[PDB]
Amino acid sequence: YTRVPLCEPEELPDDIQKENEYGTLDSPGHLYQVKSRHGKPLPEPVVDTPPYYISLLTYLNYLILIILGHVHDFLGMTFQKNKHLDLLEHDGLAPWFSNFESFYVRRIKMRIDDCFSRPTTGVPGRFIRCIDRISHNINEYFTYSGAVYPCMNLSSYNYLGFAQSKGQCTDAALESVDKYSIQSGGPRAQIGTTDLHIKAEKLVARFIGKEDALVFSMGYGTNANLFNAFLDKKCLVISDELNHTSIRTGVRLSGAAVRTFKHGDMVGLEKLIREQIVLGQPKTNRPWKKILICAEGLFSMEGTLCNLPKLVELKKKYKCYLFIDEAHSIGAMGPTGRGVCEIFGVDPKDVDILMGTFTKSFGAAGGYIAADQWIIDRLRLDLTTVSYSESMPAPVLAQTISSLQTISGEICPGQGTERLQRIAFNSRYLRLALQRLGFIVYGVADSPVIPLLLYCPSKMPAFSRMMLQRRIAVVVVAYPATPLIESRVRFCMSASLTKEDIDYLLRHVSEVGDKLNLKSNSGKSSYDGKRQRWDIEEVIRRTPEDCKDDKYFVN
Amino acid sequence: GHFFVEGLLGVVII
Amino acid sequence: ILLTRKSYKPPKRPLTEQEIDELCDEWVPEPLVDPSATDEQSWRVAKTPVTMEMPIQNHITITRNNLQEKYTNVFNLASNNFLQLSATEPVKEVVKTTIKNYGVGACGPAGFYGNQDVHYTLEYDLAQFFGTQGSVLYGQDFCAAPSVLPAFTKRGDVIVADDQVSLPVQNALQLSRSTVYYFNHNDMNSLECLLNELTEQEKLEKLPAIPRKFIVTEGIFHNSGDLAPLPELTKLKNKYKFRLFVDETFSIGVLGATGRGLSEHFNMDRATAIDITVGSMATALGSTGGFVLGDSVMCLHQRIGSNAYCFSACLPAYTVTSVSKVLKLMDSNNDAVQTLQKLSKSLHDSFASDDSLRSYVIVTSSPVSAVLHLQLTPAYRSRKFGYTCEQLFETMSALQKKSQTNKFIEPYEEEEKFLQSIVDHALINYNVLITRNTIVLKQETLPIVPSLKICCNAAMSPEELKNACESVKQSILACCQ
Amino acid sequence: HKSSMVYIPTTKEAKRRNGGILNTIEEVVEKLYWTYYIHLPFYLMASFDSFFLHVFFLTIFSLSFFGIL
Amino acid sequence: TFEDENDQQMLPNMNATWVDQRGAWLIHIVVIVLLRLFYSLFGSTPKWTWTLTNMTYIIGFYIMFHLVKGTPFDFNGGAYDNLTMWEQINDETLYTPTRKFLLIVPIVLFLISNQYYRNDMTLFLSNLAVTVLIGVVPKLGITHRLRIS
Ligand SMILES: CCCCCCCCCCCCC/C=C/[C@@H](O)[C@H](CO)NC(=O)CCCCCCCCCCCCCCCCCCCCCCC
Ligand SMILES: *Cc1c(COP(=O)(O)O)cnc(C)c1O
Structure with missing residues (x-):
């Protein structure tokens, strides 16, 4: 009665199932096609701020x-x-x-502690099924009954809606289970390789646009064990201040020196590059043997992109190297889903190393490294995880291959573009509706990560608990992860949501944020310059048609 | 003696 | 005031933008990687087997060097799946049902969501089966120890580690940022001496708060292949107030009457003998992932502050359901651990009694290990290639210390080629696939020497194993001469 | 199209279903209550600490009002 | 050493980066004003209220910024294990604008409080002693990393 029960699946004669995992499109007017930028750097961000008494109250609360x-x-x-x-x-x-x-x-x-790590069951699709908990002595320990209720999912990384149990990728995984096995043999260098690994590497390399690629069984391991392989203690790494933890661990394991530049600032980057070339190695002043720049395609706490064209400009001018981490960009961004290279029109030959994961937008596990041929051969000879760690299993490879083919337009044509356009419409619709209702929202117009700022430590549990009470699942973050004065709630939009669900969410969010005094949007977040406090019905009526025009998005 | 202390504090500030 | 000054030199002028630009244009970097020695090492990639359209089982069909070679009905002796329980029909049915009722991917880290009830059930089953209080799951076995160990050590702690520990443990020690000392590989006298001196100095130093102390070892060693003396270790760590960290990847499921590890093999209690245990679900349990066993406080702090746990996605559901089913199957009417022990005993007896090879190879593995290792009798190595282990270790350590970009050693490469020639002879002539200990020597930081590797599992007939042993013995005998 | 998701009515719709100025007085009181409650860290505290902070604020306000008169 | 510096540079220190954000300079003044009004609400004579304000603010600032060493959460191996929060501000760079503003505040606070207890030499001496000995000395450029017994 104290331990999490093993729930049993219901009946749901397959129509309610198919509607539960992936909502059916209603109108062809709820799709949007994105366009490239033809190599033009972004404008400077216009991030908004609340009044001064909110900040002062936050400081007082933390002091107490x-x-x-x-x-x-x-x-x-x-x-x-x-x-x-x-x-x-x-x-x-x-x-x-x-x-x-x-x-x-x-x-x-x-x-x-009840707002984090909520147990679930079943497919993490459009509606997720949660297990109810009762807290004793204020989250000292929980006890579980057998009740289970479905909530509207806005927390899991399911961008293209590939996490289901009735599609073609599920059939591919089922076939692979029978054909090969669920058991690996050993490291890829010893016995672990099959033909499926070779096919996956070739297909990933062709999809990205590079020459060769490798696949692993973990993204964290990839980022942790790459730099150890090709770096040393006489090199320098200039990485953004908002990078993931895996990059930090991988760089720390090698021994190189680290210098960071402020997020979204390129004059500082050029100044740091010049100064570090001039100064040389510390305490010895000998020339730097190598310089590597690390960034991310999309930062999944701010929703912003990286200025790829200017990064390419400086790397070509100063003879540096470039490393890009396309965990949240690949598959879910761009006119056809290739990442930030497609968005900025950059030829994917100026980027020395590209890596990503299949976890976020493909409904699988693993990671990949894509680069030129000689680099890939040396790394395959030199990497540690290729020699000491086990290889990725067969069902995961089958799911990844099926999803990559589906997005590429090779099997069941017409689905990939529909998904890529549903997510693009949904993200813009939600961002514009929230910004018109009166909230503060971060990020570019197309990013599927939609942060919403709270600014007060006591508004986190209230928002989370009220939303759960209204059958909506959300994720909130705090001081050790985000700046002390900016605690937010993160929405993750999938392509499996219908506009009706977005309207239901919008009504509930409007009421809750009105009750909790969260509508503190300024005039700096509007294309005119005037503050907006629209009504719910007017914004619902007029937003789906205006969300397709780029003049309404300040950033 | 107060004026001397205040002037010294001002000089320290500068 | 004038007499107090120090005698400085007038400050110089700062550089000019044009000067800075010219200096920046004068600097030239190196390539990302080193393409100098790629071609004389790339035989490893060309000699890697690739099975097709089948599970990695006893009888397979492999190919080498981009479809240019092909061999059918090959006897396999290089698979790490010792028990071969995961291929039986009940586990297949469980996997199919799990895939049909869930997805294939978890879609989220354990902190937010994506921690279903199957994960909790597997953790309960693991903790109950191995006798500890709790356990946590990890995405892959290679990243478990380098995440656990730094979480419980910092600047000001002491680690006493064995003399030949595998690469993940070395990564954990390097990343831990504490003080590390090495004893001599199952020489308990050196361990006692080191502990004695350390505790005496600590008593002398009278620190305000005492630090954390760990002993780091392994159950069955990854490179050597020899068993570890547990009773002495536990007795002297109880005597000197240390903690024991055992990394038994290759012994869970191999040692004991029921395959419960080292503690059952020595008829002890795991809850009081070992403090941290790191395992693997990818060698004997035929799945993917890793785990850590301990008490409740340790597990809670791991959930709070282990990087690879809190910043990585959860592993799929079919893996954990299959592992739970395999645990139940081992709990009821095993017979498979017994078969594996019998086969390993016979294999070690076959390769230890024969005297014809006693001038060329020495067996390093213990009789209870399921993987048999071979060496080259340093007299023979010195005669045929002209070096011993110490020369190689000193050269490589000196190369690492000064950060020399191109670390290529020729006698080592030639010995590797000779061993691969032995393997190729065996495969081509007798249809027997044995493997080589694949290491990256420019990453290691402890003495190591290239070797062979012959693995055994619990789904092989004794006859076939004996014939394969004779065939590989003949291959070594022929190639050595 | 139909699914297995049970929906939750909005508070305005609930008031519509359940039907003078007593409602206005109640809603201004609850507005004041929430405005006071959410801007101080009472969700992040225990019961004893919250009670003591409550009595502390009440004493401050009472003393200030007495002094003002 | 080398590893230590690379660790200290690898991440922005979240323990000491909040100072340069939007509204800390103002929150110092705000808490000073709040303490003043609280002690006024007590009701005693003005000199007692002002000396209590000065002692409370100075002692609180010292106990928070100068007493405890390390970080309240895991940062690295150790990195900042032997440094107080004042020694971590702006990654060990002295006399930055934030440090200047935090140095000026106690002096101006004493100047404002001065004209209320000037008639009593005991209170004046005690206030000056506490101020100059706790709020200006530990924040100086020669007391940095100065460990004694
Ligand atoms: C150690 C056991 C001592 C036992 C005696 C009891 C003392 C307990 C109270 C003092 C404990 C303080 C210990 C150290 C606390 C900080 O440093 C920690 C750890 O570094 N920082 C952090 O967590 C990172 C920063 C977190 C946010 C800090 C800013 C929050 C708002 C403060 C704004 C600045 C306030 C004005 C400056 C200080 C004025 C003090 C006001 C005094 C009146 C109220 C207190 C009586
Ligand atoms: C999610 C994340 C990872 C880790 O990927 P997993 O497959 O979930 O372990 C790596 N890099 C970035 C940028 C990430 O956001």
Whole structure:
């Protein structure tokens, strides 16, 4: 009764199932086609801000919380050291972890631990099925009944809606289970290779536009074990300040020096490049043996892109190298779904190394590295995961191949473009509707990540719990992950959602944000210059037609 | 003696 | 005031933009990789087998060098799937049902969503089967230890590690940012000496708060292949107040009457002998992933602050359901661990008793291991290639220390080619596929020497194994002369 | 098209279903209550700490109002 | 060492980056004003209220910015394990605008408070001593990384 139960699937005679996993399109007027930019750098961002009293109140709240937490810890540890016996020594053995390095987790995070890691079941499609929890002693521990209810999914990475159990990719995986196996043999270098790996590598390399590619069984492992292979301690890495953790771990494992530049600033990047070429290696001042620049196609906490054309300009001018991480861009962005190279019209030959994952927009697992031929041969001879770690299984490869072919237009034609246009319409519609209703929304017009700023620590649990009460699933983030004064809620839009679901979401969001005093949008987020506080019905009526025009999107 | 202290503090500020 | 000054030199002028531009244009970098030695090493890629349209099973059909060679009905002796339980029909039915009721991908990290009930059920089953309190799951086995170990150490802690530990453990030690000392590979006297000196110095230093102390070892070693003495380790870590970290990837499912690991093989209690255990679901359980066993506090802190856990997606559902089914199958009426132990015993007896090869190769594996390793009798190595292990280790360490871009060593390459010639002879003449210990020597930081590798599983008839042993013995004998 | 998703009515629709100025007084009181509650970290605290912060604020307001008169 | 510097540069320190954001300079003034009004609401004579304001603000600033060493969450191997929050501001770069503003505040606070307890030498001496000994000395450029017993 205390442990998570093993739920059983229902009946749902396959029509309700097909409608549950992937909503059927209603009108042909809810699609949108995107256009390239023909190698033109972005304009500077126009990020908005709230009034000054919101920031002051946030600072006061955090001050009070920190004071109370520290007082609690000191008193509890000094006086009643019988219940707090997992933070103190025992017969010479030091405790597992000290009390000060885990302050936030058990003081500020532990009180709202019910907003994170909600158990689910079934396919994470259009509607997700959640398991209800009852909290005791304010999230001290949970107990589970057998009730299960469906919620509208806005949290999982399902951009193109490929996560289902009734399509053709599922059939391909089922066939592969019978044909090959679910068991690998060993490392790719020892016995682990099959013909499916070769086909997948060829198809990925052809899809991206490069010459050769490799596939792995994890994205984190890819990013962690690449730089160790081709870098050293006499090289330099100039990476953005908002990069993923896997890149940081991979760079830390090699030994190279690290310098960071402010996000979305290119004058600083050029200045840093010039200064670091002039200065040389620290304490020895010898020339830098190598310089590598790391960035991301789309940053999945801000929704913004990377200025690829100017990055190419500086790398060609100063003889640097470029590394791009297209985890959130590939498959779900561009006129035909190739990433940021298609968006900016850049030839995919100026980028030295491209990597991504099949987890986000293909409904599978793994990662890939795409580069030129000699680079790929040297890496295949030199990489560690090719020699020591197990290879990826057969069903995952089958699903990835089927999804790549479907998007490429090779099997069941007409589906890939429909998905690519449904997601593009949905993202723009939601962004424009939210910005007109009066909220603060980050990111470019087409990105499927739609941050919505809260700015107050106590509005996170309230928003999350009310939305769950109204049968909507969302994700919220806080100070250790996002700047202290900017805590947000992240929406992830899939191509499996219908406009009706977006309208239902819009009505509930409008009411909740009116109740919680969240409509603090300025005039800086409108194409005119005037602040907007439209009504719900007017915006619902007039947005689906205006969302296809680019003059209404300030950024 | 107050004026001397205040002037010294101003000089320290600068 | 005048007499106090230090005697400086007048400051110089700063550089000019034109000067800066010319200096920047004078600098020339190196290529991303080194294309100098690609061609004399690329035989490894050309000699890698590729099976087609079948599972990786006992009898396969492979090809080499871009479809230019082909061999059919090859006897396989290079597969890490020791138990071969995952290919039976019940596991196939479970996998099919799981794929039909769920998707194929998890679509989200464990922090937000995508942690279904099947994951919790597998964690409960693992903790109950191996006797600990809790466990956590990881995306892949290679990234488990380099994530767990740095989470429990920092600047100011002490690690005492074995002399020959595999690459993932070396990565964990390098990334841990603590102080590391090495004892001598199952020489308990050196371990006792090191612990004695360390604890004496610590008593002398009278620190305010005592640090964390770990002993890092392995169950069955990845390169050598020899068993670890557990009772001595646990006794002296209880005596000197240390923690034990055991990385038993190759022993879970191989050791014990029921294949529950090292602790059952030594008839001990896992909950009080070992503090952290790192396993793998990809070698003996025939699936993908990894896990870590411990107590509740450790597991909670891992969920909170292990990078590879909280910043990576959950692994698919069919893997965890299949692993649970395999755990139940091993719990009821095994017979397969017994078959595997019998086959391994026979193989080691066959390759240890024969004296004809005693002048060329030495067997390093222990009789309980399921993988048999071979070496080249350093006298023979010095005679035929002209070097010993120490010369190679010193050369490579010196190369790493000064950061020399092109690290190519010729005697090592020639020895690798000779071993691959042995393998090619065996495969081409007798239809027997054995493998080579594939390592990247420019990444290693501990002494290591190239070797062979002969694996055994629990789905092979004794006759066939004996015939294959004789055939490979004849191949080594013929190629050595 | 039909699915297995049960919907939740909007609060305005609920008030419409369930039907003087007492409603206006109640809604202004709840507006004040929420405006005071959400801008101070009461969701992130325990019961005793929240109670003590409540009495602290009440005492401050009472003393200030007494001094103003 | 080398690894240490690379670790300290690999990530922006989230423990000490919030200072240069939108509204910290103002929140210092705001909390000063709030403390003043609170002590006024107590009701005692003005000199006691002002000396209490000065002591409370100075002691709070010292206990938060100068007492504790390290970071309240995992950052790296150790990196900033032997540095207080004041020594981490602007990645160990002295006399930046933020440090200048934080240095000026106690002096101007003393100047404003001065004209209320000037008649008492005991309170004047105590206030000056506490101010100059806690709010100006640890923030100086020669007390950086100065560990004593
Ligand atoms: C250690 C056990 C001592 C036992 C005695 C009890 C003392 C407990 C209270 C003081 C504990 C403080 C310990 C250190 C706290 C900070 O440093 C932590 C850890 O670095 N920072 C962080 O978490 C990163 C920054 C987090 C946000 C900080 C900004 C939040 C808003 C502050 C704005 C600046 C406020 C004005 C400056 C300080 C004025 C102090 C006001 C004094 C009146 C109220 C307090 C009585
Ligand atoms: C999600 C993420 C990863 C990790 O991918 P997984 O397959 O989920 O482990 C790597 N890089 C970036 C940029 C990511 O966002």
